[PDB]
Design a protein around this ligand. Structure first.
Ligand SMILES: [Ca+2]
Ligand SMILES: [Ca+2]
Ligand SMILES: [Ca+2]
Ligand SMILES: [Ca+2]
Ligand SMILES: [Ca+2]
Ligand SMILES: [Ca+2]
Lengths: 185, 185
């Protein structure tokens, strides 16, 4: 099975990364809420076409999730089906490159919402904001950021992101992927 | 000092039990927000006098917190002063009965907001609601409830509450006080 810890972090992604409207189910409306968030904050900074593209990748994301986790075909992914989906992939995956495709769209989407500045690096202030406007318990933000940047050896970029997302989803033990929940391992 | 774990749970109470408006500081306005919450949900079920009493205990609570943690006298308790306050009491406390007095008002207030039904027991559905309308990651609510009720040996009442609040605030290790963050030890 998955241990407690694993299930805790899986709940974490259900809740914070997918169930935008908080009803205990993943459904297209959750994805429409991502879009609302998107337009909400970017407004006219983005063109109509940009929102359209964004939408197509969300549609395409929902489609891949729905088609993998919705066992009884009612267009709703419940927690239980979402757990089941994770138990199946943890059972056999080894790098970010093995995750189900819907993940390949969730990763960049999550990263770009953190990198408020567009340089492809989430700096400390951006991280601190991640922790705030995402209610996580970051008690020493600089120390959580140092686990991520590994004492300044590693830049918090997309390839760093990818690694941590992976660990958040699959490790049977507290490691750096924990930083995404705003905690130190 | 306090270890990481301890500091994590302390952040938890700052954030969920006191900083209602989310600005990284505890201030009277946070307490006014408790009152707003209170009237928000109880409306006319409570009389004017009941709100007044409630207010007096919050005022009295703020007063005791402010007078213990506000080191530079600016009527704002920051995270750092709140951490400092906790480092001081963990250093020397042994039962719920040793916690600073402001706690003696936070405990019942938190308990009565969980016990939506008024019987002095927070049952499983109430707990489940605690976990929802309080965004915690309860991945198996019945299993978290069984750590609290200890397999049905113990009723989830105020004296049970008190014990767990205590452990949440002071243990240097994962135990039953963790259930209040909606997690299994
Ligand atoms: Ca939903
Ligand atoms: Ca379904
Ligand atoms: Ca950036
Ligand atoms: Ca505040
Ligand atoms: Ca102060
Ligand atoms: Ca009750």
């Amino acid at each position: 099975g998955l241990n407690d810890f694993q299930k805790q972090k899986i709940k974490f992604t259900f809740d914070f990364f997918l169930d935008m409207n908080h009803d205990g189910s993943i459904q297209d409306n959750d994805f429409e809420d991502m879009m609302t968030r998107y337009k909400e904050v970017n407004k006219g900074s983005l063109s109509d076409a940009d929102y359209k593209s964004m939408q197509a990748s969300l549609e395409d994301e929902w489609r891949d999730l729905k088609g993998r986790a919705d066992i009884n075909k009612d267009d709703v992914v419940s927690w239980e089906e979402y757990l089941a989906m994770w138990e199946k992939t943890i059972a056999t995956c080894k790098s970010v490159a093995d995750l189900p495709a819907w993940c390949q769209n969730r990763i960049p989407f999550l990263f770009k919402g953190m990198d408020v500045s567009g340089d492809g690096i989430v700096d400390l202030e951006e991280f601190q904001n991640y922790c705030k406007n995402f209610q996580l318990q970051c008690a020493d933000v600089p120390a959580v950021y140092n686990v991520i940047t590994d004492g300044g050896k590693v830049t918090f970029d997309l390839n760093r992101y990818k690694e941590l997302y992976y660990r958040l989803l699959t490790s049977p033990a507290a490691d750096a992927g924990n930083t995404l929940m705003g905690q130190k391992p």
